């Protein structure tokens, strides 16, 4: 949904964005691992295990 430019990180040394862009991806790999686990209505036993 956006296409940023990678020639902004070498000169300006904000390596925050390139780390917030990964940890912001692990935290949305869960949201698709739960949204499926909850869409077949597995149980309130599998959710509490994940």
């Amino acid at each position: 949904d956006i296409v940023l430019n990678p020639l902004g990180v070498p000169s300006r040394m904000n390596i925050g964005q390139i780390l917030e862009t990964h940890l912001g991806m692990a935290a949305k790999g869960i949201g698709d691992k739960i949204n499926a686990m909850l869409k077949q209505q597995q149980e309130v036993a599998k959710l509490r295990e994940f």
Binding site: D1, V3, N5, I18, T21, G24
Partner: protein, 249 residues
Amino acid sequence: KPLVGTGMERAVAVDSGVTAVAKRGGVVQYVDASRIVIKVNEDEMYPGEAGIDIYNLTKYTRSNQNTCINQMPCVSLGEPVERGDVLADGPSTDLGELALGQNMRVAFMPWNGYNFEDSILVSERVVQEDRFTTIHIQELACVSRDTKLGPEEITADIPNVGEAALSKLDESGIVYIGAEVTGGDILVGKVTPKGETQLTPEEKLLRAIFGEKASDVKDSSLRVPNGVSGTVIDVQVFTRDGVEKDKRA
């Protein structure tokens, strides 16, 4: 919400007064988009003649930059509220957290030069879903001074204007409430007295040829500034004490 926060957000959407923080724990008793009624609990109830509490919200109202600041309920009927809990969001808060903007799937790569400098590309699934669409609330004021040539009026009759423009405003002169106006429409019909014509010689034949009745009153109404369009959500009228209130007033 910030998908990657820093934990120091609940202390910024509570310390500022934007949130409608609950003042005594209890049980919600009536939710509504403009009112919350918190049935107080037992022990946190005053000694004599206590009853219940009630919080009002503040629907669409204009801040200092012309953005809107409106609150919303975030609780249903039956929630046990508590001291310091939250009942209403504000402008950019969610469930108490402080969400300043939206978070969207980003990728780092050069794409055909449409992000040459620091600039940004944007998919069209971010315009359809309407996640970056904000609301702005302007305001316009039409004062009718007391000239030394006779006073102005707020009459809804205006010299040489066709009904394509006098469609929205009712007979009292002010516009309606909810009429979607655009650039150039009229919002308040106002005419000012003008004499001292002294019209040119060439045009003074142009009048006698057709009979154009000269103007006793000049048109100085309030028309919407160019390049803008939005429903007229509210109208207020102030009057000097000593002049009658027309029907719309």
